[PDB]
Symmetry: D3
């Protein structure tokens, strides 16, 4: 029983790093993720990680309050660097080789995203954390996850949510799909990331796997080709 | 009326805490009000350098206790100040106030990299200069950056904006015996072991005779009072 | 005469193709003419942001088919836009037009690194701002950058300068049935599956109600016609 | 029969990468060069590569058309980065470790030229591609080839041209020299790169070898000390 | 007899690199230091080096002459980069893997200080040279030595002076202490670096060892836990 | 009186040696005087670009003989020019002269990164532009940078400021037969094998017809004499 993927693009939503308070970053979750990612690295799986920032700031949210949307999005991107920073540290303290890259240059703190460098790091079994998403306002980290996934030629984009997967509707009667095609998602107007991102993933045939990052072992199951979450291909 | 400001150039240190205003994150309404108060100083001809905190988001020390490497915790803290500096600058722009955001740690694209020469030139041109990422080094606080930058830009005084009317004998929101002084010397702040800033900062401010006035920025118009020379906060001189 | 421009700020997207003008490379005479036309807009008080293409030199997709890694192909394409931006800026300077070249990917020394705050400040100061390297990311086109930057700088409209009078029903130089519309809605450009820009861009322009006018830049004075509100090209609105 | 050089500075003229049309970049040529350079790397030869840009833009040429010479030269230098980019990729797809450096910082795309880094890469058998020449206008990549050659202490500068070597005149009667001294080149006013470059190579005793990059195996022959092209020393 | 420290922060004062003239940099001293540091690296000791600049420029000194103190300090910091440059080279010519980092970004010349990178280099037995001190005016390299020492979690800060150690007064009757506590230093107003630095080292319990860098083998003795110089702890 | 400068834009190359003035390091009083002389040129409407040497601190070649790798020696030399550029800029600021320090090798924070477009814009705005780190490449001297930058900014002339009245037949402080010419052609400087600059530089200046005037900057007012067209130093033209 060997893993089913060689290189993956793990997308961690920012809310996944929140404690009970539903804000900031929660050490315990980060520490557990480091252990789960550690296991994948040992399993020979190359891991690229795109991290969210919504647990701190959402540009759109700041804009409604009156702020210029672009500055709000810059803050949001910065927030992802903060999460990337905390995640990288959790990885290092777990003795996992990891490099934090940023689409927005932040000398000293981490390194600027570099495709060539990124590929070289992955081939050398370094966990590469991609922060600041796409580097542009008006986008989400989901778009960065798909863009970076395509860029590093990941076998799949693993979207870690707080739910088991894709449901017929936000789960009383709602059931969970095990597999879907981009066509069926759109057709039924199912909820799987932002349209710009999904569309991007579709046009490039980047398969997506929606799974629950709170269910311990879920991540491992997904890479081991075991029944877990929903697969989106076609 | 007829009165004129007592300072020509100041280093205003906006504490992160004071940017919270209930519920963490940033309180838009507070930022919007500060932009109006700073706007008034600019119009009054006062050159303003602003060092902003980040404790309303992250404190390295706090993150370290949770297990994180202290240096990475401080880097996050410094980044948090850039986030506040970003929000503050925007509030300034939307209030039609010319402002630049400089960062101790280069984050090119989102804001300027701190530059002393540039900073002086901007201040002389009546641009509000926001200094973020504090000193750029871990193991320090923005209070140290406020004193360092204040000395660097040759500010006439460092105005520490906080949530308390001044320098108390103990945290007023936790100790009912809390009492604040209206005047203190660098010395008295050493014998009375009073809290103003981390000794590292204070000492720097002392050796260079940089006066410090602590006031509450939650008090609308308090900053203006300070600048006009009216009874507000705690003055700390030699 | 008596007429005034209908736009105060525009995002002009100069397609690489239109910079070819026979024989690949860049056609000096075309650049020189564009500088004169843009010069006129600046004098008319119109703030101009320019997103320039690179397909007259390299197209990532094209390089990929030849065997190159798509990402490196797109990086070359983006660099190609910087080359055009460089030539265009120079044409602007030699025409005595204040202009800045910003690049999505920092190439410090040769040109400025794109900065939103800086860009707005330059536009307000009547500086022509040239945006190169498009969005800075592979898998996108400059058309996406034109829409993104247009939204970013709050342009009143995106003017797509091409080699055809407007949005045809098919490539006019290859299909004799080719016909262009004078008006279309984001919707009609979806039902009629008409070609304007990559859906990625268009969609962005739609969600933000950024109007788009496609015109031929090979037509001397066509840009001026657009800006003055005269019949030219294809207008795409909501 | 082992190679005769340990570290070399390979100078590829921009026109060498042009297809039949005599413009842009031709995949096939790049792909073949990657194979030839691959062989040198395996032979233990450390390779530094200075690439031209004249197959895209020549500052002087742009200036005559009316452009400011400095901007024309900046475009020319950028053109070399484009070639460096394509060449590096050809190297990677041929499974050859290679790093593209630039005298003009281009964050993300490639790395900024760094002498220390360059030496370290060469010692680690990484092909180092130097683009943007000297970084200054009013110079040619030939000057960069000599400057970088001296900098990395290359044993020789291999100037790859479309000709077998140095002739008595641009080859009907013209014959090819097998060896020359800097003195004889100047004396007879022979055509071997720009004066600024040649002079630089002379003052530092940087030997030069002019050879035909279109003649398959020529490069290998030159490094194997076999009769090929012209040698310039003294 | 194995060494007593694993990672150290070696602080070289700028005057230690001066020749007889008492100015500039003296090759011979640099060459000897490279040999002594080489030995530590081979002994498995991870070495971080903070270098001074007072052998070239002191901001305070330039200020008295009329210059703006900040610009004077920038020159002073630059001076440390010059020493760092010369020291790194001495290390490379002695075949010691070394990287020069700077708190003030100096593209091409060396690398910008990076904590993560620094730790990674030390773990890989690379001598890391930290120049431009803290990067801020109004500080000394002694403060940088303590700050960087704490940052890289060095076991001790070795302050190399022109004296055997800490004396009761600048050595006729003055005697040398073998061990002191931060409290006794302050209490007796003993001379051990700047207050800002010492205080910093104290608050973090960073032990300090003052020793003579001119006494050949002194450095080795200190790392071998042999009687040498003064220890400052508590 | 009634006289006007003969140059509109010059490239002033301040040799490191001339910054020594007894005892190595920099002589504050010399820097202060130069600031006053340059101040006068700026007021006279003359645009000034300044390329500064570093030999008063480090010479790569010199360091190499001692055993250091030549490239690292040259990097130190270039850094030395940044140190002089820093001191010179400050002397200019304290003399109330608008000045920018640009460096061939980016040292962001302490000074601007050299930028041709920026440089021209600064000169046109009467800012003294100081160019440090010479050409940015090892194996060259600041004399080459002076000629290169001079050509780049289209200076009317390169003024080589040294410690000798002009171009002598041999080092005047070591050879008593030393004699200087008042006029020379690029050719004569080749047949007479006279010393002005490294052939690499000179040749560049020749091919572009960049005139060169060598004068002593230890002579108070000599720079002004040159600019006013009065007998001073050695003129080297075609
Ligand atoms: O490429 C990107 C990615 C994210 N964001 C901003 O950063 C936040 C990151 O949070 P999220 O993607 O986790 O929701 C977003 O809300 C948004 O404001 C962008 O502007 N661009
Ligand atoms: O020079 C500085 C300034 C701030 N900080 C960090 O960033 C936070 C900024 O918030 P504050 O407590 O200064 O408001 C601090 O808690 C600290 O962790 C530093 O590391 N260095
Ligand atoms: O955001 C962008 C913009 C452009 N390009 C690349 O650069 C070329 C720019 O030319 P154009 O086709 O947009 O004119 C494209 O073909 C493409 O390969 C990108 O990778 N990303
Ligand atoms: O250091 C250099 C090297 C090249 N170039 C420019 O870039 C082009 C590169 O092409 P070439 O050297 O292959 O002819 C030149 O024509 C020239 O315009 C420079 O300005 N400086
Ligand atoms: O963080 C630092 C370290 C040093 N210096 C300056 O650089 C010189 C370095 O020499 P020293 O620390 O060896 O005395 C100091 O004199 C001072 O002017 C600073 O401004 N900040
Ligand atoms: O383009 C340049 C300019 C200067 N230098 C170095 O820096 C020193 C600058 O001093 P100078 O002799 O030009 O005054 C030179 O000795 C040399 O080692 C270079 O490497 N390249």
């Amino acid at each position: 029983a060997k893993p089913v993927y060689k290189r993956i693009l793990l997308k961690l939503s920012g809310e996944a790093l929140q404690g009970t308070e539903g804000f900031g970053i929660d050490a315990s979750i980060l520490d557990r993720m480091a252990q789960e990612i550690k296991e994948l690295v040992e399993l020979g799986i190359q891991v690229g990680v795109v991290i969210g920032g919504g647990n701190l700031f959402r540009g759109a949210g700041l804009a409604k309050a009156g702020m210029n949307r672009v500055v709000g999005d810059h803050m949001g991107m910065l927030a992802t660097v903060m999460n990337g920073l905390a995640m990288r540290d959790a990885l290092h303290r777990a003795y996992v080789n990891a490099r934090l890259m940023s689409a927005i240059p932040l000398n000293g703190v981490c390194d600027s995203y570099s495709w060539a460098e990124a590929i070289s790091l992955l081939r050398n079994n370094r966990v590469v954390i991609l922060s600041a998403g796409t580097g542009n306002p008006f986008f989400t980290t989901d778009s960065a996850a798909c863009l970076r996934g395509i860029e590093i030629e990941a076998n799949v984009v693993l979207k870690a949510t707080k739910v088991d997967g894709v449901f017929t509707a936000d789960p009383p009667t709602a059931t969970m799909y095990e597999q879907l095609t981009y066509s069926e998602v759109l057709e039924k107007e199912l909820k799987v990331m932002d349209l710009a991102a999904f569309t991007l993933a579709r046009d490039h045939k980047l398969p997506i796997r929606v799974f629950n990052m709170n269910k311990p072992g879920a991540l491992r199951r997904v890479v081991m080709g075991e029944k877990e979450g929903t697969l989106i291909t076609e």
